[PDB]
Design a protein around this ligand. Structure first.
Ligand SMILES: CC(C)(COP(=O)(O)OP(=O)(O)OC[C@H]1O[C@@H](n2cnc3c(N)ncnc32)[C@H](O)[C@@H]1OP(=O)(O)O)[C@@H](O)C(=O)NCCC(=O)NCCS
Lengths: 1032, 92
């Protein structure tokens, strides 16, 4: 939307980005003075104010400050000091609002008269830009709209100087006419390039010295920041002149910019009783109007809404913030919290309500003593399961939770809250049963919903003909016809999709705000598409106007941006309109009706669908034009389209603050263009009973909801007194029409079945599917990596080395430090043993064959087994089986000798006693020094004594030492049961130790062969004995 | 049960085109194994069905088989034969 900016920001933008032939003075010549800043620094870094006269103004968004006495003229430096004292720092009320003053601006003075002051204005409208010039400027203009010279500029064209001369600048002297003609053109160029929507200079001084701007009011489009963020620097949006934003209120605005969700909150008086946290913008407006209509004008405290499919954290923060701001007061009468909302279509009801459960779970102490009663009502995707979660959680906590579902009226909770009710070239047709649609984007949900509509409406032709996703090639995607297989075709470019079926008539775009404009513009180039529905919210207003004008000249109807779309029961739906499957079944939207409605909000359109379904034989078609200020189609367009449809019998109009569209509807009714019975209601009637409204932008009393409702009521429109009676009046008109006989209610036909998504079926807990895999070593699903129950940050904090991580991953145990260090030593010892062994040889051969690291390492590793690399495991098993039996080492040696088995882990080629193996010596020294008990190592050393008595070189090997010491570690460290250690030896933990250790050496060998640039190896023929058969 | 009643959608994560074993008949690329054997499509024909999903002409299948035979082995001195021999002598 459009937001007003400060005077200084507008002035600096004008100075930096102006392009005109006029002489520009006061360029970067201004100073911002603040109550809480160093004055000495201000006159030190910027002393250029010491030369000429100074003018001081307040820069807190003050309108018509000239007559208020806040404008100081002819001030000296000491004069400025004396002038700022009596008003700066405290309250200075204006009109009906109250607020302080903590920001002022000072500029140089120029001597001039009223004849040199002129009024310049530009403001953006649906048809382009209206520019106003007034020669008798200053603060004497008064009424301006019907007095100043007005010129219209169409969308997407330049402003020629001669039009300014002979149609805009008529009452000025020629000498200054020549300069103003170019100055206004440059001003318009600056306005258009920076994406401003409202620019105001009053007054403007022009003289032989140059052009001076005394006061400037600027309203710019925030949504177009991505077009001018580099050209805006650090732009700020000052709040309207009033009470400063609360520290918790601005937190909601901070959440607003986290994602595409809408998160707004405003405060008037925190001392009130009624508090609302209603989901959805339009739903929140309706709820506020309902509460203020029946006696909540002043007792309401907050005004907040949340929509746009907020996530878990966003809704959690919103709820905790609103409750925290709720618990700063004690109300003896009592406290209530109305949270309602319309029927949601895209917002995840379950996630948001789980978030507010988590937010209310810990906010129970500082709320129970404040006697807070919560009234909950909602509908949408996964509403009932979360609703019963609310029921059970509210029963568990104890606070009064009043749960109302879809079956109850939207505003009934408000009625029971205060005790008022006891507590219980366009075309007349756009979509048809044969309509084909192209969905642009990675939006599978839209296609699924449209296709499910095609089934529940008993259509023999899918409404979705193509999918366009530029970042993937032409392919086919899984879907069902009935319950059998179909494939939707997904294309890269729009041209191919348009050509492959030219009968497609409607396109619905789900592209983000960056590419929505370009995609829509390129879609406009094909005459097959007759209706384009834009779903993105946040498109710049100028680009939206360009799209609207191009569609109007192309004859293509538009569903305006910032909406969920529309639904035609029995024929067609746009995007996520109508909600999920069971809501379509409940709202009875799978058969055509006789009454049609038009609105702006998305979810509240589904609420109107529900109201009509409850009180009328069904809906024929409903369209939401969007929340942007310039929707592609207005209310009047859809009203005429419904009027030209014979199937439609009643018209419903449900808008809000903004525009004079209802006056146009009344005018069309009076002169005989509209004849069908019409029920209309303008929400926002409470906007006059609040302090200031932000979520629109009414200018006069004519654009007020109450005035529009009255003008509709006494013009031939069935307007109820409020939204509460809207259902009753609609039902009464339906009864009158069926009593007349124009409407013949057809009998119901049962809808067919359509399959349900597995993921959201699994979320509801409706399906059991057994897990095919079981893991226990690592968890990566959470926000932190987990190693056997131990977080990675805790792994590194505890200084668990490679051995500690190995223990966690292989044994799921927190091993003692000496165990981890012994594991690392074992890895170091087995790291490599030269290139001559089988595994190193195979790795070297594969590396010299040009293969990558993985293939060479793998080729080497696959030799590890019984003859190579299996000595650790064999030695451990042999010594463990000997020691577990009662046999003494001598008996073990004799028993091995009898069976013709060499004791695995004994015997070295060159090392003997009085010539120790150094690797064995290091490992054995560490094991003796640090291990608590080494029974198997003692047994193996006795066996070594015997075998060395037999023959000197029969010493305990590296393999035997590592095996027996690893058995001792697993068995006598206190982390394993004896059965656990036995199982870990049995399943091959020592094979893993050897393989992981020798992988280092094998990778080193691969890197060495690559670095040495060794060529392909072929074994010599003379080293091979060829003994082949002679004839066989 | 839900899949049998056809009220649950879960997309398949794998796609295949060469062999179907679910049915009463083993099928190589849309051809039953009985028809594979009764039409004398040997190693080459099965290879064409499984690798290219085509019924190659008879001479193509025989040429594929001849290519397999000529590359069957080239002595123990080459790298792959050397590694296979060494891994075999390691008891694997
Ligand atoms: C194919 C190509 C490698 C020919 O190689 P070459 O250098 O002519 O000969 P080789 O590499 O076979 O070996 C040369 C000698 O080593 C001998 N030799 C080959 N393998 C041996 C082994 N395992 N032990 C001992 N000697 C061997 C050969 O008998 C030959 O002996 P000679 O010098 O007495 O004739 C060469 O032309 C080329 O690079 N061509 C590119 C096309 C290609 O790469 N084709 C792949 C081959 S199917």
């Amino acid at each position: 939307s459009a937001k007003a900016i400060s005077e200084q920001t507008g002035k600096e933008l004008l100075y930096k980005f102006i392009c005109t032939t006029s002489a520009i003075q006061n360029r970067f010549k201004y100073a911002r003075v603040t109550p809480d800043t160093d004055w000495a620094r201000l006159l030190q870094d910027h002393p250029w104010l010491l030369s000429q006269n100074l003018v001081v103004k307040p820069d807190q968004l003050i309108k018509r400050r000239g007559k208020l006495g806040l404008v100081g003229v002819n001030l000296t430096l000491d004069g400025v000091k004396s002038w700022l004292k009596p008003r700066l720092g405290q309250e200075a009320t204006v009109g009906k609002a109250t607020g302080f003053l903590k920001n002022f601006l000072i500029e140089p003075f120029v001597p001039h008269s009223q004849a040199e002051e002129f009024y310049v204005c530009i403001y953006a409208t649906r048809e382009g830009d209206y520019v106003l010039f007034h020669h008798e400027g200053g603060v004497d203009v008064g009424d301006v709209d019907a007095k100043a010279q007005k010129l219209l500029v169409g969308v997407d064209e330049k402003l020629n100087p001669e039009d300014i001369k002979k149609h805009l600048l008529v009452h000025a002297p020629e000498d200054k006419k020549e300069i103003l003609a170019s100055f206004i053109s440059g001003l318009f160029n600056f306005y258009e390039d920076l994406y401003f929507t409202y620019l105001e200079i009053n007054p403007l001084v022009v003289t032989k010295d140059g052009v001076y701007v005394l006061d400037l009011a600027a309203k710019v489009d925030a949504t177009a920041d991505y077009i001018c963020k580099v050209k805006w620097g650090d732009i700020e949006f000052p709040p309207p002149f009033g009470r400063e934003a609360y520290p918790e209120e601005a937190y909601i605005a901070d959440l607003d910019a986290k994602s595409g969700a809408s998160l707004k909150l405003t405060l008037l008086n925190p001392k009130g009783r009624i508090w609302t946290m209603v989901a959805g913008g339009g739903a929140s407006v309706v709820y506020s109007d309902t509460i203020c209509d029946l006696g909540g004008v002043n007792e309401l405290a907050n005004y907040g809404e949340y929509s746009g499919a907020p996530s878990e954290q966003q809704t959690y923060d919103y709820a905790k913030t609103i409750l925290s701001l709720m618990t700063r007061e004690k109300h003896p009468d009592g406290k209530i919290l109305i949270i309602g909302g319309s029927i949601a279509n895209f917002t995840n009801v379950a996630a948001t309500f789980k978030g507010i459960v988590r937010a209310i779970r810990d906010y129970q102490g500082p709320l129970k003593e404040h006697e807070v009663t919560i009234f909950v009502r909602r509908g949408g995707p996964n509403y009932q399961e979360g609703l019963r979660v609310m029921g059970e959680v509210g029963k568990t906590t104890g606070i009064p939770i009043h749960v109302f579902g879809t079956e109850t009226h939207m505003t009934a909770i408000v009625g029971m809250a205060l005790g008022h009710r006891p507590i219980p070239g366009k075309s007349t047709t756009l979509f048809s049963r044969h309509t084909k649609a192209i969905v642009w984007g990675m939006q599978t949900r839209a296609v699924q919903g449209m296709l499910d509509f095609d089934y529940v409406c008993s259509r023999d032709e899918p409404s979705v003909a193509a999918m366009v996703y530029p970042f993937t090639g032409d392919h086919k995607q899984k879907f069902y016809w009935g319950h059998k297989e179909i494939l939707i075709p997904v294309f890269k470019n729009m041209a191919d999709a348009m050509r492959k079926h030219p009968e497609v008539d409607v396109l619905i775009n789900f592209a983000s705000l960056r590419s929505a404009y370009d995609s829509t513009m390129e879609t406009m180039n094909y005459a097959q598409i007759r209706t384009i529905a834009i779903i993105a919210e946040g498109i710049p207003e100028a680009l939206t106007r360009k799209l609207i004008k191009k569609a109007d000249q192309k004859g293509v109807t538009i569903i305006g941006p910032a909406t969920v779309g529309g639904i035609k029961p029995g024929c067609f739906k746009i995007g996520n309109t109508g909600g999920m499957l069971d809501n379509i079944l409940a709202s009875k939207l799978y058969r055509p009706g006789s009454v049609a409605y038009v609105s702006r909000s998305g979810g509240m359109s589904n609420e109107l669908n529900n109201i009509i379904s409850r009180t009328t034989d069904g809906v024929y078609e409903g369209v939401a034009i969007g929340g942007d200020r310039y929707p592609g189609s207005t209310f009047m367009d859809h009203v005429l389209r419904y009027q030209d449809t014979p199937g439609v019998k009643m018209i419903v109009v449900l808008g809000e603050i903004g525009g004079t569209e209802e006056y146009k509807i009344c005018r069309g009714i009076k002169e005989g263009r509209l004849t069908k019975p019409i029920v209309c209601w303008c929400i926002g009637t409470c906007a006059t009973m609040f302090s200031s409204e932000v979520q629109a932008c009414a200018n006069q009393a004519s654009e007020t909801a109450v005035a529009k409702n009255q003008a509709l009521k006494e013009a031939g429109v069935f307007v109820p007194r409020s939204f509460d009676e809207l259902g009753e009046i609609i039902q009464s008109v339906y009864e009158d029409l069926v009593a007349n006989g124009v409407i013949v209610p057809a009998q119901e036909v049962p809808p067919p079945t359509v399959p349900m998504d597995y993921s959201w079926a699994r979320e509801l807990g409706l399906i059991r599917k057994p897990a095919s895999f079981m893991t226990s070593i690592c968890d990566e699903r959470g926000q932190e990596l987990i190693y056997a129950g131990m977080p990675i940050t805790e792994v590194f904090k505890e200084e668990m080395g490679i051995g500690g991580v190995l223990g966690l991953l292989w044994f799921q145990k927190r091993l003692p430090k000496y165990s981890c260090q012994f594991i690392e030593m074992c890895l170091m010892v087995t790291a490599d043993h030269g290139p001559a062994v089988s595994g190193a040889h195979n790795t070297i051969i594969c590396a010299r064959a040009g293969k990558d690291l993985v293939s060479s390492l793998t080729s080497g590793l696959l030799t590890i087994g019984d003859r190579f690399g299996g000595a650790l495991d064999a030695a451990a098993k042999m010594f463990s089986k000997a020691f577990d039996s009662g046999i003494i080492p001598m008996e073990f040696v004799n028993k091995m000798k009898k069976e013709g088995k060499l004791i695995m882990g004994i015997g070295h080629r060159v090392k003997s006693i009085n010539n120790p193996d150094m690797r064995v010596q290091i490992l054995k020294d560490y094991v003796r020094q640090h291990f608590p008990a080494t029974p198997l190592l003692d047994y193996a050393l006795e066996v070594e004594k015997i075998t060395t008595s037999k023959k000197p070189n029969l010493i305990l090997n590296v393999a035997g030492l590592i095996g027996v010491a690893f058995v001792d570690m697993l068995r006598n460290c206190g982390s394993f049961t004896r059965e656990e250690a036995d199982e870990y030896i049995d399943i091959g933990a020592l094979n893993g130790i050897f393989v992981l250790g020798r992988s280092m050496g094998f990778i080193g060998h691969y890197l060495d062969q690559k670095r040495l640039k060794q060529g392909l190896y072929r074994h010599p023929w003379d080293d091979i004995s060829y003994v082949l058969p002679e004839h066989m």
